[PDB]
Every structure is written in C-alpha cells, then in structure tokens.
Amino acid sequence: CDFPPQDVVQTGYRGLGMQQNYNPKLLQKVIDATQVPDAIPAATPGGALAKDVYKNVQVLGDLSVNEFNRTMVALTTWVAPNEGCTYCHEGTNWESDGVYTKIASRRMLEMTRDTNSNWTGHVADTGVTCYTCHRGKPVPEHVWTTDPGPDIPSVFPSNGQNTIGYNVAYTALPFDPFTPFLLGENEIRVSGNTDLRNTNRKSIKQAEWTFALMTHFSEALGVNCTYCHNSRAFMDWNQSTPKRVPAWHAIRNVRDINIQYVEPLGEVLPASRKGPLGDPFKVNCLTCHQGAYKPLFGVPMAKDYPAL
C-alpha cells in the first residue's frame, strides 16, 4: 500500500491521462542515495606536458602535469576510495601494467571520452564521469549478463518467458530483452505505416519482446509510458513528447558502450566478473539512471575535468 497523498506532474494536454505520479515516501529513498561528490580545487596552469615527463601515458598525454595529478586524485575518489591508489598499480611503480585494473581503467577512460564528446544527442552538456556508475565502488551496482533461465529438464529448450522476471518489472514477459536489443541490434518497431494489410510480417511474440524492453525503460527512469508516448498511437512520432528523441539516441549509445568497450574486456577481467555463460557484466539504462529521470537529478559534474 502507498497511502495518500501523492505528488502528480502534468505532462500533456488536459483530459488525456499523460502525467507522472510520485509517492513522497518512496522518492525519499532515491533522494537519500544520490550524494553528489565534493569538488576538487582547479589546478595551477601551465608547465610541462604529461607526454614529455611520464613514461607510459597512452591516453592522457596532452594534459599538463598538474592536470594529470588532479585527474588521478579524482579517479581514486570516484572508483576506489577505500583501497586507495594501489588499487590500480603496484606499490609505487606507477609505470607498470602488472594489474588488470590498469588495462580496464585505460579502456574505461577511452569509453568515457567517447560518450562525452560524440553522444551529446543523449547526454547533452551534462556528460558522465566514473561516479555516474561506480558511485565509489569498484563494481557497479546495476549490471546484467545473458540470462540462462530457470532449471528445467535437459531435453527442454528455453523459450525465455513465463517466469517471474525480475528485470522486466515482475511480469510474465520475456525475461532477457537486453541480449537482442542492447548488445545485438534488432528492430524495435512493430507497427505498420498504412491501415490495410501490407508487407509487414512482424508477429505478436516480437511485440512481446518490445513490450519487455519498454518496461525496463520505464523502471530505470521512474516514469510511465506517457513520459514519451500517447498510448492511443505508440508508433506516431507526431503524437510523442520531446523526451522520446533523447531515448532514441540513448539506445544507440548503450550499444556502442557494450560492443566497442565493455564486452572486449572479457579477456582481461577475472572469472569473478562474469556470468553463467561466461560473458562480463554489461550496461543498462539502470546503470546510470538508477531510478531517476536524470542520473543524480542532472548536476553537471563532468565540465570541471578536461581529461573526460
């Protein structure tokens, strides 16, 4: 039970539905978990470059040395604050690659720069840092792997549904829509462009897989269908909200993160960071929103750091 009163935000014409509903007691749990990190004082300008002073820099070579050290202080406070600087080095041999965390970290720096520069159709001028997903822990909280399903007899193949389904909002819908959509690249659209029978050959099962993915979009942001659609025509772009256009880019963005960066790391990481089928943990909508309409309610952290 969620006892009244509630908070309602209108987001459309009057008498059409189209509004978002909040319970003040549940929203307090999301407010009580954000915790924007504290600023790091800007670095003294000018000096020698990192490429001319350090021995093994392959990404951040065009920062001054002050900017470099500042970036490293930030990487410690964002990812691994408990274990300290030796989480990704040996003792004080900074230039060694003897740990896998340094390879992982280098690849992650590249991925964050790519998202911050090339995907502004989705993260527009707020960008991301490490803290957007690690939130001060080495392993992020909300990730996914390819779901094998419940245990069934050995001669029975999986259909991929009719269970509880914890990632698709507790429905009996297909329980793993991320493999075909957020790592593979399948068509999400199912409806026709004319009113009578034409060349469209999609089925009700494909419609169910789409419905599953949309359920996850709703849960990961704290909203309903009507945050981006008018239900009377889920396929018309002239009857959608403006928020449908960033989500369209978000999809593509997530595929990039998983195809170019995170899945190829399956060689470097240990067996601890993999699932039943032997693939690493991957990124969702929930990996950075974590139940809010913008990660951390949209505080712009990434502008203060020229390394990202």
For residue 178, state whether it binds ligand HEM (rule: CB under 6 A): no
Distances (CA, A) of 123 to 68, 91, 229, 276: 25, 37, 21, 32
Q: Which two tokens stand for residue 291?
A: 């139940």
Report the residue number, 4 or 153, with the smaller CB distance to Ca ion.
Answer: 153
Sort 185 into a burial class: Cβ within 10 Å, 0-12 / 13-18 / 19+: exposed
Long-range contacts of 287-291 (CB under 8 A, 24+ apart): 287/133, 287/140, 287/142, 287/143, 288/128, 288/132, 288/133, 289/220, 289/221, 289/222, 290/30, 290/33, 290/141, 290/142, 290/220, 291/30, 291/219, 291/220, 291/221, 291/222
Task: Please provide residue 290's backbone torsions phi and psi, each rounded to the nearest 5 degrees.
Answer: 60, 40
Q: Tell me which of Mg ion, other proteins, Ca ion, none is bound by residue 195, counting a contact when its beta carbon lies within the kind-specific cut-off of 5 to 8 angstroms.
A: other proteins
Which listed range, 75-83, 146-154, 165-173, 262-270, lies at the site for ligand HEM (CB under 6 A)?
Answer: 75-83
Q: Determine how many CB atoms are found less than 10 A away from the CB of residue 189.
A: 12
Give yes or no for residue 22 binding ligand HEM (CB under 6 A).
no
Q: DSSP letter at 3?
A: P
CA 15 – CA 34 distance, rounded (Å): 35
Any known ligand binding at 261? no
Residue 123 known to bind ligand = no
| Cα separation, 116 vs 119, whole angstroms | 6
Q: How many residues bind ligand HEM (CB under 6 A)?
A: 44
Residue 114, marked binder: yes
Determine the angle formed by the axes of helices 100-118 and 244-256, rounding to 10 degrees. Answer: 150
Instruction: Give dist(CA 136, CA 36) in Å, integer.
Output: 11
Query: Which residues contact other proteins by CB under 8 A?
Result: 13, 16, 150-157, 159, 161-165, 171-173, 190-198, 200, 202-208, 210-211, 231-242, 244-245, 248-249
Least distance in angstroms from the C-beta of 257 to ligand HEM: 7
- For residue 89, list its beta bridge partners: none
212 binds ligand HEM (CB under 6 A): no
Partner whose binding site includes residue 60, from Ca ion, other proteins, ligand HEM, none (CB under 5 to 8 Å by kind): ligand HEM
- By C-beta, is 15 or 113 nearer to ligand HEM? 113
- x/- mask, Ca ion, residues 210-249, rule CB under 5 A, reads ----------------------------------------
Contact set with ligand HEM (CB under 6 A):
54-60, 72-73, 75-76, 79-80, 85, 87-88, 94-95, 102, 105-106, 115, 122-124, 126, 128, 132, 217, 243, 246-247, 250-251, 254, 283, 285, 287-289, 293-295, 298
For the annotated binding site for heme b, the residues are 55-56, 58-60, 72, 87, 89, 94, 106, 122, 126, 134, 190-191, 214, 227, 229, 243, 248, 252, 273, 289, 294
